Design a binder for these strands. Sequence first.
RNA 1: CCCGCAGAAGAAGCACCGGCUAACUCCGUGCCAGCAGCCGCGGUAAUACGGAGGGUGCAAGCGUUAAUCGGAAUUACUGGGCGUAAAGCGCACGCAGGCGGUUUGUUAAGUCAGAUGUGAAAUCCCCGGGCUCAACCUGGGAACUGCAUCUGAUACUGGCAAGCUUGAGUCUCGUAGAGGGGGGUAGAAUUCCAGGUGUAGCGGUGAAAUGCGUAGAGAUCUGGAGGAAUACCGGUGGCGAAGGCGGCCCCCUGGACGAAGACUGACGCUCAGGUGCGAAAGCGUGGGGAGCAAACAGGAUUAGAUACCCUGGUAGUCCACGCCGUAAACGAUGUCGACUUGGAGGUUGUGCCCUUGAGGCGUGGCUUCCGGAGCUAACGCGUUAAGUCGACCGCCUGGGGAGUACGGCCGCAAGGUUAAAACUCAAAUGAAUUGACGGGGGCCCGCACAAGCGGUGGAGCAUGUGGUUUAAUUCGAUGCAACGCGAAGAACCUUACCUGGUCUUGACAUCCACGGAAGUUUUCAGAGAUGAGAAUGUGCCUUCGGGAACCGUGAGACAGGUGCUGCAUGGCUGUCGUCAGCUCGUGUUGUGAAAUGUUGGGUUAAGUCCCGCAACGAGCGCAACCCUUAUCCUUUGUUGCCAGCGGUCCGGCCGGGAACUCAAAGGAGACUGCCAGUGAUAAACUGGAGGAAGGUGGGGAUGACGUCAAGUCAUCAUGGCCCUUACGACCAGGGCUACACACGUGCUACAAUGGCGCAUACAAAGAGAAGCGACCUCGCGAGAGCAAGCGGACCUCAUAAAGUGCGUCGUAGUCCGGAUUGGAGUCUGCAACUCGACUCCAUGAAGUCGGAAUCGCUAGUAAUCGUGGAUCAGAAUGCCACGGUGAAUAC
RNA 2: AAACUGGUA
RNA 3: CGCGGGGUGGAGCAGCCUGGUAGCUCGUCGCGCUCAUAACGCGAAGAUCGUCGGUUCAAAUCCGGCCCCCGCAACCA
Length: 206
Amino acid sequence: GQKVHPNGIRLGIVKPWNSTWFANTKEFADNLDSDFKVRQYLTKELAKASVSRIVIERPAKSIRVTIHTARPGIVIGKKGEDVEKLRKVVADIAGVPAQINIAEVRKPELDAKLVADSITSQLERRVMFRRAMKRAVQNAMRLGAKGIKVEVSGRLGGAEIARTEWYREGRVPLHTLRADIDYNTSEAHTTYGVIGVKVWIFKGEI
RNA sequence: CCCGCAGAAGAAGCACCGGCUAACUCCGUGCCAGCAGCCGCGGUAAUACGGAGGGUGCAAGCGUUAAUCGGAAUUACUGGGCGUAAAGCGCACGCAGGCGGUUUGUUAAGUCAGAUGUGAAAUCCCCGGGCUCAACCUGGGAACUGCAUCUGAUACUGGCAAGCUUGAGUCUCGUAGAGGGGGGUAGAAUUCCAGGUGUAGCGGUGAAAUGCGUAGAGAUCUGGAGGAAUACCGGUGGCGAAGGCGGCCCCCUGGACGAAGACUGACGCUCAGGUGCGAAAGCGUGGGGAGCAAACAGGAUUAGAUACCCUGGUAGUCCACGCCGUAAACGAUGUCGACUUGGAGGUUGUGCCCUUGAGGCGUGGCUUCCGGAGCUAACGCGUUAAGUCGACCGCCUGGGGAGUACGGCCGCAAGGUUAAAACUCAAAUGAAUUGACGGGGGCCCGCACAAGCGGUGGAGCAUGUGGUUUAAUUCGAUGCAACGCGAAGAACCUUACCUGGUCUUGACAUCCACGGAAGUUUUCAGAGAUGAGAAUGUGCCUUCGGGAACCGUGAGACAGGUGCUGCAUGGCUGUCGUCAGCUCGUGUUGUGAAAUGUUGGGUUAAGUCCCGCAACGAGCGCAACCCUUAUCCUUUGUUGCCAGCGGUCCGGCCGGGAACUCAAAGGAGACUGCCAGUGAUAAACUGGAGGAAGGUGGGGAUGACGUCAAGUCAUCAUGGCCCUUACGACCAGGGCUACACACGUGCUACAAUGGCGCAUACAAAGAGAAGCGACCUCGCGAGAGCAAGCGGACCUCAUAAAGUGCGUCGUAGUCCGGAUUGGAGUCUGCAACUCGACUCCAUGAAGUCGGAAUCGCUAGUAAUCGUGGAUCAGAAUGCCACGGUGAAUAC
RNA sequence: AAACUGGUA
RNA sequence: CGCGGGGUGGAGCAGCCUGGUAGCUCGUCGCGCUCAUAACGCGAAGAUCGUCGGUUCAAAUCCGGCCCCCGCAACCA
Ligand SMILES: [Mg+2]
Ligand SMILES: [Mg+2]
Ligand SMILES: [Mg+2]
Ligand SMILES: [Mg+2]
Ligand SMILES: [Mg+2]
Ligand SMILES: [Mg+2]
Ligand SMILES: [Mg+2]
Ligand SMILES: [Mg+2]
Ligand SMILES: [Mg+2]
Ligand SMILES: [Mg+2]
Ligand SMILES: [Mg+2]
Ligand SMILES: [Mg+2]
Ligand SMILES: [Mg+2]
Ligand SMILES: [Mg+2]
Ligand SMILES: [Mg+2]
Ligand SMILES: [Mg+2]
Ligand SMILES: [Mg+2]
Ligand SMILES: [Mg+2]
Ligand SMILES: [Mg+2]
Ligand SMILES: [Mg+2]
Ligand SMILES: [Mg+2]
Ligand SMILES: [Mg+2]
Ligand SMILES: [Mg+2]
Ligand SMILES: [Mg+2]
Ligand SMILES: [Mg+2]
Ligand SMILES: [Mg+2]
Ligand SMILES: [Mg+2]
Ligand SMILES: [Mg+2]
Ligand SMILES: [Mg+2]
Ligand SMILES: [Mg+2]
Ligand SMILES: [Mg+2]
Ligand SMILES: [Mg+2]
Ligand SMILES: [Mg+2]
Ligand SMILES: [Mg+2]
Ligand SMILES: [Mg+2]
Ligand SMILES: [Mg+2]
Ligand SMILES: [Mg+2]
Ligand SMILES: [Mg+2]
Ligand SMILES: [Mg+2]
Ligand SMILES: [Mg+2]
Ligand SMILES: [Mg+2]
Ligand SMILES: [Mg+2]
Ligand SMILES: [Mg+2]
Ligand SMILES: [Mg+2]
Ligand SMILES: [Mg+2]
Ligand SMILES: [Mg+2]
Ligand SMILES: [Mg+2]
Ligand SMILES: [Mg+2]
Ligand SMILES: [Mg+2]
Ligand SMILES: [Mg+2]
Ligand SMILES: [Mg+2]
Ligand SMILES: [Mg+2]
Ligand SMILES: [Mg+2]
């Protein structure tokens, strides 16, 4: 969209990076490739756990990953057995010793990545978008959001021509760098094509 | 009709499924075939066409066609309309006809009441009865709404008789008026004729020409002829039935209004047919004809102009007598009568009064505007109704055909009046709302214009595109918003495209079987891919039948597609446009679409802010938070720096120090903040002080709701379709670099503000490990050998050019200008021929400032001068980025 | 001063 | 042998008492203007003076022949 990405324009203001590792030009590209590969693998296996965001850092010659989820039971289960296999496989793919950590994020409905997935999941199960999206809105504000905005684009309802529909409630100042906006997207693969979902959540002014 | 035998045995189809209207999916087709009562579907994803499955409706029937009523209040008696949707005759007078104030009597026609007679049967309806129920048949009743006769009622209508005055009318006294017909006369001005002075133009247009004038125009003065109209007064003035009627005077004559008083006594309203009047144009006869002006002539404009414009000009316009009878003949509103809140004016009468006044209080006629209830689709009308009623008349029944054809009547003619049908469409139309647009208006902004500088379009060259050709010249992108664009690097690869040579579970993922360590070395053929051999090697885990890393062969599921659809899409992007706007809640207004807010008075770069207000609040957007830059302060002080001191090959280089530049972390500061003035006292504006920085200080990032079915299926993903012994995969070469032309964006020049030689100044920002590559040696050179240092304030790329100090050229195709071309070289790379970059020697085209046209820029801007970076083995005049010098003009 | 026009669905 | 004027580029044209670089209207090929077309503007190609002989720096303008067209005469086939 012609609007600059909120999660990219505030990286140096109120949005920490999802990767905090340092490296020279000799291995910067290799580190990027490893990070992308591990993220792509992990997000597929942990689809049920509803991972919000995955942060990766470089301890003293090793790989450390921290995944924030609202359903730590699936990834933890009994003892650390379900995380041991994930640790060993991520270490295998990264080529260096790995350490994975689980973080709990309560009130999942207030998370952008998560709210979207909900929507997309629903749509994929032939649910009326209009209402899928309206609940998302209400849910959130109930929880306390100072604002929320939802948008869905594509062949809504299997129509012959694509259409975009959005709902905005509360206050969502996109030009205020002081404010923090949790922005995220998500896609769906329905029999009629691909439907894009896009959610902004405004939590505070600073 | 009843009984007996046997046996589910002999018995279900038609229409429809997009909305109306009950009932949905797939496949085929691709604006074709076809469907269709109306709206309308079908131009590769059809619930509308064809088939299948499923479903809905009806059923021995179902559907289509034909016809009547209904719906249709769409001929409106019950029960419609005519200001603007169709529809008030141009106006008036009036016969027939319709209707008609009030008091009594009489009649009993209309009217109403009762009775009698009649209104065939069948049929319709109510209660019953019989066919096995029903249809069907049948008993009784009701109805048969009507008609006639007789007997009564007398409120209303009608008739007859007799009255009344409020409707209508006559008489007396006055008033205003472009009311009408005839005659007379006056002033101004235009034209023309005669004469006087005078002399080169006049006249007309946007600008011209035609035209008039030296045979004397135009201008000016004197005299005369003739035609037409009456300048102000003159007005939201007047008169007239309408059309219509303006100088002044006379004669004849119509209507209206006011004062009371008297008189008649319903004598009234309306009006088919009929009669009369009736703008302008037009016609007939006879006059007149100054101006104006159809037709016509010429000159202009134009692509054309038998038009708009200009110069002339006939009919006509004028008069008398006749005819024509039509107009947006409009108030788009028929006449008459009654009732219904007001306000402000004009014109014309009249009554009472302290009458002092150009004054107070009343009562009539006509007339203009605004508005209440009411009405109206709305606009609007509103005591002069389009409000509530009554009497009569005229007219309307979708649009076009058509106010047309035929017939009749009228006219000298032109034509007028009355007035159809066939056929064709699903609309035509009225009021109002939102938006857009206007060769409408107002206000405001932007390098929009203007004022300036420098350019492009001319020449050479670089690059992209179109076109053409080619084996291929891969595919995209196309006004602004494509054309140095995807592409931040086409000699192989890249690379899909062309020609050849090869493969078919494959180059790549995954399941299975068998064999085989991987890998390292060479050889035959061949352009290579490729086949075809010899070698070497035969190791980890190893449950001792094998796995994990990996290689070869084979079968089938598959893998694969830069193949199509950006008009199925996600994601991403361009533009209007960094313009200030775009919206939502409740509230209120309107039948409604919608309006309000959001408009108005100020102000701002801003829907920025203040005041007002039928609105009160909020959201996106603007500003502000962010980065950079300009001043100062705290900390820190090397690889950076050197003020005060010292030893100083007298170099910040070596003791040392940290003041300062500087480097990077944290703070201060600028906020219309302090004052003056202006301004509705508010917002705000102008100026001043202080201050490095005065008015969001300069610059960047930041791009609202939406438009362009804008771009991308090729970055990637993805619905549908297609290929899969080829549209997939491998290799050699070629091509994307062609070239009779055109266009876009740039570089280098046409020189003296310069070129060349010597000397010699002053910068910032970046990269560096298959990398940057000092110094030294060789070479006139691109470069080669040696090769330290440096993963970085250290070393290298890397001595910035413009600039300034001297000398030469002295205005030319030149000591400017460099393309082209020949010879000889340097360097990346398996590979420089198609097709790279750089260097040395030689030749030295075009070009001497560039048409129509067109582009950027308002301050460190433009202008011009250097340096770096990405892409990248080797490549820039392109892209990104840093600094030096440094303007002109904005009324 | 001049200043036309815009295939069909 | 028939009274006059003529013959410039694809077409129509200017140079006459003035024998001095071939120019101007419409056509062809370009460019500009416009969203696009027409209109309009700026440009380029295009030549023995119809064809020959005397005269002459010179060219229908000074002349003399040849060929073609037109006013009429041109009969009329
Ligand atoms: Mg239905
Ligand atoms: Mg189909
Ligand atoms: Mg009816
Ligand atoms: Mg009606
Ligand atoms: Mg009338
Ligand atoms: Mg009458
Ligand atoms: Mg009566
Ligand atoms: Mg009677
Ligand atoms: Mg019975
Ligand atoms: Mg019976
Ligand atoms: Mg009967
Ligand atoms: Mg009576
Ligand atoms: Mg009288
Ligand atoms: Mg009549
Ligand atoms: Mg007349
Ligand atoms: Mg006449
Ligand atoms: Mg006459
Ligand atoms: Mg005229
Ligand atoms: Mg008429
Ligand atoms: Mg009139
Ligand atoms: Mg009128
Ligand atoms: Mg009328
Ligand atoms: Mg009114
Ligand atoms: Mg007629
Ligand atoms: Mg007739
Ligand atoms: Mg500016
Ligand atoms: Mg200018
Ligand atoms: Mg050029
Ligand atoms: Mg394609
Ligand atoms: Mg192309
Ligand atoms: Mg194309
Ligand atoms: Mg290639
Ligand atoms: Mg598109
Ligand atoms: Mg309402
Ligand atoms: Mg608005
Ligand atoms: Mg509004
Ligand atoms: Mg305002
Ligand atoms: Mg605001
Ligand atoms: Mg010293
Ligand atoms: Mg100041
Ligand atoms: Mg901003
Ligand atoms: Mg942007
Ligand atoms: Mg398109
Ligand atoms: Mg396209
Ligand atoms: Mg090849
Ligand atoms: Mg190319
Ligand atoms: Mg030189
Ligand atoms: Mg480099
Ligand atoms: Mg560095
Ligand atoms: Mg040379
Ligand atoms: Mg020169
Ligand atoms: Mg390179
Ligand atoms: Mg036309």
